[PDB]
Structures are given as C-alpha cells and as structure tokens.
C-alpha cells in the first residue's frame, strides 16, 4: 500500500510537471519559430 | 533470465536450508550412537538370548 501510494503520488506529480513543461515547450516552440523569422531577418540583412 | 537467475539463487538458498535440515538429520544420525552403542550391541552381547 505504501508502494502504491508513493507510486501514485509520483504519477500525479509527474503529470503536473508534464503539463507545466509541455506548456513550457509550447512557449519555447513559439519562441524558436518567432526567432526563425528573426533568423531569416538577420539572414536577409547579411545578404543585403 | 537475470531475474530467473535470481530465482535460481533463492531456490538454491532453499536447497541450502534443506541441507541444513539434513545436517540436523545427520546430527540425529549422530545422536544415534548415543544409544546405538547399545542398539548395535543387543545383536551381539546376548548371543543365545538374541
């Protein structure tokens, strides 16, 4: 029973951490996509 | 098969416990001369009576 309760508390804390870090990776994907437009911006500046 | 080897280890531990029980049996076989010195002699010392 103590194995079950610590396993389920680890599961719920890992689910909460996974939701938080999935929001984080979504934000980071949007960030790297907006910086890709900054990547192409600097690329066009270098080309010019 | 590593888990099966661990199961073999616990089984051979049970077999060592069985050997310990057998050592208790040979100790009971050792406790026999305590009276077998008289149990083996009742076949010999009383020639006609036996």
């Amino acid at each position: 029973t103590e194995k079950i309760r610590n396993r389920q508390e680890k599961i719920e804390r890992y689910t909460s951490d996974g939701t938080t870090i999935e929001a984080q990776i979504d934000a980071k994907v949007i960030y790297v996509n907006e910086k890709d437009s900054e990547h192409q911006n600097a690329r066009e500046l270098l080309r010019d | 098969m590593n888990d099966v080897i661990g199961f073999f280890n616990e089984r051979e531990a049970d077999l060592k416990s069985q050997y310990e029980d057998k050592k208790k049996f040979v100790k009971e076989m050792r406790d026999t001369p305590e009276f077998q010195s008289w149990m083996r002699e009742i076949r010999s010392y009383d020639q006609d009576t036996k």
Partner: protein, 265 residues
C-alpha cells in the same frame, strides 16, 4: 527445440517493460517537413530565376515534378511505415499484457516447446506493408508545379475549367479569357487574393478597401450571392506566381527591345 538453452518464448517483465516503454521512433516528422520546405522554397527560387529566352522548360518541369512526386510518395510511405510500427508495438504490448508469470515450470514448458508467447521477430520479418492510398494532392507545393508550362503563350488568360482536378497533373491548364487587373482599383494587381466560394481574384488593397465598412459584404462580382468574410479568403500563390512571371516576361521583352535598338543604331 534444445538448440538454444534459453526458451524460444518468454513472457515480459516489468523491469523489461520499463525499457520497452522507453522505446521511441526517430523524429522523422521534423526532418521531413524541413526538407519539404527546403524543396518547395528551392522550387520557388527556380521558377523565379527562369527566363523566357531559355528554351527547353518542358523537360525540366517534367523532371522536377517527377522528383517532387517521388519524394512525396517516399514521405507518405515512411509515414505509413512508422504508423505500422506504432501499431505493431501496440500489438506487442497488448500481447505481453496477458503474458504468464516467471518461474521454473514456465521456463521448462517454453524450453520443451510451447507456442504461447509470440515474439516480435516473426511479426516484424513478415510484417504487412501498409500500401498507402489517397495520394496527397491537396498540398500547395503540389499546386505550385505545372503552372510554368502553357504560360509563354498567354499569361493573362485563364480557362474556366482550370480548377478541374480530373487531370493527373494537378489541374487542367488551358487558354481562356480572364482579366489581369482588379476592377476595384483599375490597376494590374501585384498582391492577388481569391476564395474558394467566390472564385474571383482581387487586389489585396482593393479587397480591404471594399471589405471594411460593413461586417457582411458580398463580392463585387456576380453569380455569387453568398457573403464572403475575411476567413473565407485563402492565399493562392499560383495567381501571384503568374503575375510575377508576366512581369518578368515584360521586363525580358523590354530588355530585348532595348538590345535590338542598340543593334540597329
């Protein structure tokens, strides 16, 4: 049979199930989408660097569209392959979920021969190919091709049945009668827009000057009584492709006229 001391079949263990869940396929999606994007952008820079003086464009568009359809088929079959691999691993996990325990009796039964736990080996060596159907033709990159042929004769014309997807080459491109200027602005547009419901091309500045002011405004053209909103309009790159190709042809013919004036003088 006794060729292998280990049993030919073996159940699954939670310690092994941990690593089994740790299995993952390679990130083919991102590399495939980025190579697709580099392929379409290099196709765009090809169709931008073309010139009317270059003769022999039919063979080059044929080979580039053959390469395009080949890479599309390869990507689709790889997608089907990884989907089938996921289905196979799900089958493996659901077959191992009903596996027996681990002890000496089960080991002996599986060593003497007991076809109870099917391994992934036999299911993977003769795995059924997915054979994907419904070829992906709705991609805009597939719409990019075939617009280069049949344009050196009359770029400012569009046959009404051009949107017919009955042909295998992404469209039925032929000569027709269409306007190259926007009637709202009365000027040859450089930023065109057209929706699937109205099927009418218009300038972006003209359509935004005509749309603002009313929350529900129909199209200026006839034969479409339904209202068209901002979300109904879609960005069709074929129209701007044709306009910029016509502009390039005009610049080329002007350069040719200037060179001829140089020669005659």
């Amino acid at each position: 049979l006794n060729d292998n001391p280990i049993p030919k079949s073996v159940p699954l263990h939670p310690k092994s199930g941990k690593y089994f869940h740790n299995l993952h396929a390679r990130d083919l999606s991102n590399i495939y989408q980025q190579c697709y994007k580099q392929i379409d952008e290099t196709i765009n820079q090809l169709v931008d660097s073309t010139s009317p003086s270059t003769i022999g464009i039919e063979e080059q568009v044929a080979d580039i569209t053959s390469t395009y359809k080949l890479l599309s088929t390869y990507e689709s079959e790889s997608n089907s392959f990884d989907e089938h691999i996921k289905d196979l691993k799900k089958n493996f996990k659901q077959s191992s979920d009903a596996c027996p325990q681990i002890d000496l009796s089960t080991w002996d039964k599986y060593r003497t021969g007991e076809l109870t736990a099917p391994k992934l080996s036999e299911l993977y060596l003769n795995m059924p190919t997915p054979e994907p159907a419904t070829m992906v033709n709705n991609t805009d990159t597939l719409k990019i091709l075939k617009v280069l042929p049949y344009i050196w004769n009359d770029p400012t014309c569009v046959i009404p049945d051009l949107q017919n997807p009955a042909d295998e080459d992404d469209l039925q491109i032929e000569g027709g009668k269409i306007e190259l200027t926007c009637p709202i602005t009365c000027k040859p547009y450089e930023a065109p827009l057209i929706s699937r419901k109205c099927n009418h091309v218009f300038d972006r500045d003209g359509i935004q000057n005509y749309l603002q002011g009313y929350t529900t405004r129909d199209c200026p053209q006839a034969a479409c009584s339904q209202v068209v909103s901002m979300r109904d309009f879609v960005r069709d790159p074929i129209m701007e492709l044709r306009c910029k190709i016509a502009k390039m042809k005009e610049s080329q013919e002007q350069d040719k006229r200037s060179s001829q004036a140089i020669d005659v003088l």
